[PDB]
Amino acid sequence: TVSMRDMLKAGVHFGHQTRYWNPKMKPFIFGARNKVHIINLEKTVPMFNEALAELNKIASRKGKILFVGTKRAASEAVKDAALSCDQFFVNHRWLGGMLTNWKTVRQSIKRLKDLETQSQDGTFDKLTKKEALMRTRELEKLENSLGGIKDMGGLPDALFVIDADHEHIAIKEANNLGIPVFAIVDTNSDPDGVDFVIPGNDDAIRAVTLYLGAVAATVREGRS
Amino acid sequence: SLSTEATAKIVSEFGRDANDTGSTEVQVALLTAQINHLQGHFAEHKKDHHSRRGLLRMVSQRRKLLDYLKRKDVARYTQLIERLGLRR
Amino acid sequence: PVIKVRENEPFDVALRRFKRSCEKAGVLAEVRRREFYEKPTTERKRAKASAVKRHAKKLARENARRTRLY
Amino acid sequence: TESFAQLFEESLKEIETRPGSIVRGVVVAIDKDVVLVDAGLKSESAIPAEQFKNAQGELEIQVGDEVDVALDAVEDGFGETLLSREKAKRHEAWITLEKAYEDAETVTGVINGKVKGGFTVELNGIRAFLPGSLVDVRPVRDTLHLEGKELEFKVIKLDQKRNNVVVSRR
Amino acid sequence: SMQDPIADMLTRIRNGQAANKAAVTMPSSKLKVAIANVLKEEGFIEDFKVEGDTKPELELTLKYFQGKAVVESIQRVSRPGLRIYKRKDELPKVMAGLGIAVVSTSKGVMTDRAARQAGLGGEIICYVA
Amino acid sequence: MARYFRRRKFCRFTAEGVQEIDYKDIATLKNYITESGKIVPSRITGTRAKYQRQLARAIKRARYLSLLPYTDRH
RNA sequence: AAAAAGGACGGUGAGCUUCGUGACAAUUAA
RNA sequence: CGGCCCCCUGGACGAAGACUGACGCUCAGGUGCGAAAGCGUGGGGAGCAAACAGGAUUAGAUACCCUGGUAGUCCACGCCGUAAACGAUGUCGACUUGGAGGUUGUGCCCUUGAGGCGUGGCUUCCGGAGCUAACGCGUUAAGUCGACCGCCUGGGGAGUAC
Ligand SMILES: [Mg+2]
Ligand SMILES: [Mg+2]
Ligand SMILES: [Mg+2]
Ligand SMILES: [Mg+2]
Ligand SMILES: [Mg+2]
Ligand SMILES: [Mg+2]
Ligand SMILES: [Mg+2]
Ligand SMILES: [Mg+2]
Ligand SMILES: [Mg+2]
Ligand SMILES: [Mg+2]
Ligand SMILES: [Mg+2]
Ligand SMILES: [Mg+2]
Touching check for D74 and chain A: CB below 8 Å? Answer: yes
C4 phi and psi, to 5 degrees? -110, 125
The domain spanning residue A114 has which CATH number? 1.10.287.610
Angstrom resolution of this structure: 3.3
Smallest CA–C1' separation from F5, nucleotide: G1
On whether the CB atoms of residues E33 and E58 are closer than 8 A, the answer is: yes
Number of domains chain B contains:
1
In chain E, after which residues does the backbone break, taking C–N over 2.5 angstroms as a break?
none
The whole-angstrom separation of Cα E34 and Cα E28 is: 10
Rg (CA), chain F: 13
Q: H helices of chain D, where?
A: 4-15, 49-52, 86-102
Shortest Cα–Cα distance, F7 to chain D (Å): 8
The whole-angstrom separation of Cα A159 and Cα A51 is: 12
C10: DSSP letter: -
Substitution target in D75, D76, D78, D81 with the highest count of A β-carbons within 10 Å is: D75
Residue whose CA is minimally distant from H22 C1': B68
The whole-angstrom separation of Cα D55 and Cα D51 is: 9
In chain F, which residues have their Cβ closer than 8 Å to the Cβ of D164? 2, 4
Among D143, D109, D104, D142, which residue's Cα sits nearest to residue D126? Answer: D109
Helix (H) or strand (E) holding A17: strand A14-17
Cross-strand bridge partners of residue E104: E109, E123
Quick check: helix, strand or coil at residue D76?
coil
The whole-angstrom separation of Cα B73 and Cα B75 is: 5
Domain boundaries, chain E: 5-69, 74-128
Touching check for D76 and chain A: CB below 8 Å? Answer: yes
DSSP E strands in chain D: the ranges are 25-30, 34-38, 45-48, 66-67, 70-71, 83-84, 107-115, 118-123, 126-131, 150-159, 164-168
The whole-angstrom separation of Cα A28 and Cα A42 is: 9
Quote the crossing angle between the two packed helices A41-60 and A205-223, to the nearest 10°: 40
Asked if F touches B (at least 3 Cβ pairs < 8 angstroms), the answer reads: no
Shortest Cα–Cα distance, C67 to chain F (Å): 31
The whole-angstrom separation of Cα D105 and Cα D114 is: 25
Sheet holding E57-61, edge to edge: E23-27, E57-61, E47-51
CB within 8 Å: D79 and A203: yes
Chain F residue at shortest CA distance from C22: F36
CB within 8 Å: D42 and A3: no
Among A95, A213, A200, A102, which residue's Cα sits nearest to residue A154? Answer: A102
The whole-angstrom separation of Cα B31 and Cα B65 is: 10
Asked if F touches E (at least 3 Cβ pairs < 8 angstroms), the answer reads: no
CATH 3.30.1370.30, domain E5-69, yes or no:
yes
Helix (H) or strand (E) holding A156: none
Quick check: helix, strand or coil at residue D157?
strand
Whole-number Å distance, alpha carbon A61 to ligand 4 midpoint, is 102
Q: What is the DSSP string of A157-173?
A: SEEEEESTTTTHHHHHH
The residue segments making up the domain with residue A114 are 102-146
Which sign, positive or negative, has the C-alpha torsion F33, F39, F40, F42?
Answer: positive
Q: What is the DSSP string of C28-60?
A: HHHHHHHHS---HHHHHHHHHHHHHHHHHHHHH
On whether the CB atoms of residues A40 and A7 are closer than 8 A, the answer is: no
Smallest CA–C1' separation from E12, nucleotide: H95
Whole-number Å distance, alpha carbon E107 to ligand 9 midpoint, is 60
Positions in chain G where some atom is under 7 Å from a protein CB = 1-2, 5, 7-10
Cross-strand bridge partners of residue D113: D120
Cross-strand bridge partners of residue A65: A158
A96: DSSP letter: T
The residue segments making up the domain with residue F71 are 9-74
Cross-strand bridge partners of residue E79: E82
Task: For residue A67, give Cα distances in angstroms to A10, A11, A170, A211, F45.
Answer: 20, 21, 11, 11, 55
**Cβ-Cβ contacts under 8 Å for C28 (sequence gap 6 or more):** C22
For strands D107-115 and D118-123, give the pairing: antiparallel
Q: H helices of F2-48, where?
A: 27-30, 42-45
**Cβ-Cβ contacts under 8 Å for E21 (sequence gap 6 or more):** E15, E62
* Region for A65 from its dihedrals, namely left if φ exceeds 0, alpha if ψ lies in -120 to 50, beta otherwise: beta
The whole-angstrom separation of Cα D148 and Cα E66 is: 81
Distance (Å) from CA D21 to C1' H115?
15
Quick check: helix, strand or coil at residue B28?
helix
Half-sphere exposure (Cβ direction) of D155: Cα atoms closer than 13 Å: 24
Cα torsion A137, A139, A141, A146 to 10°: value is 180
D37 phi and psi, to 5 degrees? -130, 135
Cβ–Cβ contacts within 10 Å for residue D125, how many? Answer: 8
**Cβ-Cβ contacts under 8 Å for A198 (sequence gap 6 or more):** A44, A47, A48, A51, A182, A183, A184, A185, A211
Rg (CA), chain C: 20
Q: What is the DSSP string of chain E?
A: ----HHHHHHHHHHHHHHTT-SEEEEE--HHHHHHHHHHHHHTSSSEEEEE-SSS-EEEEE--BSSSSBS---EEESSBTTB--EE-GGG---GGGGTSEEEEEETTEEE-HHHHHHHT--EEEEEEE-
CB within 8 Å: C25 and F36: yes
The residue segments making up the domain with residue B79 are 1-88
Cα torsion E85, E88, E94, E99 to 10°: value is 120
Fold designation for E74-128: Dna Ligase; domain 1 (3.30.1490)
Among E76, E112, E71, which residue's Cα sits nearest to residue E94? Answer: E112
Surface-to-core class of residue E123, CB atoms within 10 Å of its CB (0-12 exposed, 13-18 middle, 19+ buried): middle
On whether the CB atoms of residues A54 and A197 are closer than 8 A, the answer is: no
Touching check for F69 and chain C: CB below 8 Å? Answer: no
Chain D residue at shortest CA distance from F4: D162
A95: DSSP letter: P
On whether the CB atoms of residues D154 and D97 are closer than 8 A, the answer is: no
The whole-angstrom separation of Cα A4 and Cα D11 is: 13
CB within 8 Å: D162 and F1: no
Which sign, positive or negative, has the C-alpha torsion A92, A93, A97, A103?
Answer: negative
Cross-strand bridge partners of residue D70: D22, D84
First-residue to last-residue Cα distance in chain E? 28
Touching check for F15 and chain D: CB below 8 Å? Answer: no
For strands A29-33 and A36-39, give the pairing: antiparallel
On whether the CB atoms of residues D104 and D114 are closer than 8 A, the answer is: no
What's at F30, amino acid-wise? K
In chain D, which residues have their Cβ closer than 8 Å to the Cβ of A40? 4
Q: Which residues of D are annotated as a binding site for RNA?
A: 138, 141
Half-sphere exposure (Cβ direction) of E38: Cα atoms closer than 13 Å: 22
The whole-angstrom separation of Cα E76 and Cα E53 is: 29
Touching check for F27 and chain D: CB below 8 Å? Answer: no
On whether the CB atoms of residues D146 and D134 are closer than 8 A, the answer is: no
Sheet holding A14-17, edge to edge: A14-17, A36-39, A29-33
In angstroms, how far apart are the furthest CA atoms of chain C?
56
Surface-to-core class of residue A135, CB atoms within 10 Å of its CB (0-12 exposed, 13-18 middle, 19+ buried): middle
Contacts 24+ apart (CB under 8 A), A35-39: A36/D42, A36/D74, A36/D75, A37/A187, A38/A13, A38/A14, A38/D8, A39/A12, A39/A13, A39/A14, A39/A15, A39/A187, A39/A199, A39/A200, A39/A201
On whether the CB atoms of residues A30 and A41 are closer than 8 A, the answer is: yes
DSSP helix, strand, coil percent of chain C (3-state; round to 5): 65, 0, 35
For residues D100-117, one letter each, b for 16 or more C-beta atoms within 10 angstroms of the residue's C-beta and e for the rest, the string is: bbeeeeebebbbeeeeee
The whole-angstrom separation of Cα D47 and Cα D36 is: 6
Cross-strand bridge partners of residue E76: E126
Smallest CA–C1' separation from F64, nucleotide: H4
Cβ–Cβ contacts within 10 Å for residue E17, how many? Answer: 21
Distance (Å) from CA E117 to C1' H124?
60
The whole-angstrom separation of Cα F24 and Cα F3 is: 28
The whole-angstrom separation of Cα A78 and Cα A68 is: 7
On whether the CB atoms of residues A31 and A38 are closer than 8 A, the answer is: yes
What's at D164, amino acid-wise? N
Quick check: helix, strand or coil at residue D44?
coil
Quick check: helix, strand or coil at residue D165?
strand
Number of domains chain F contains:
1
Whole-number Å distance, alpha carbon C41 to ligand 12 midpoint, is 29
F6: DSSP letter: -
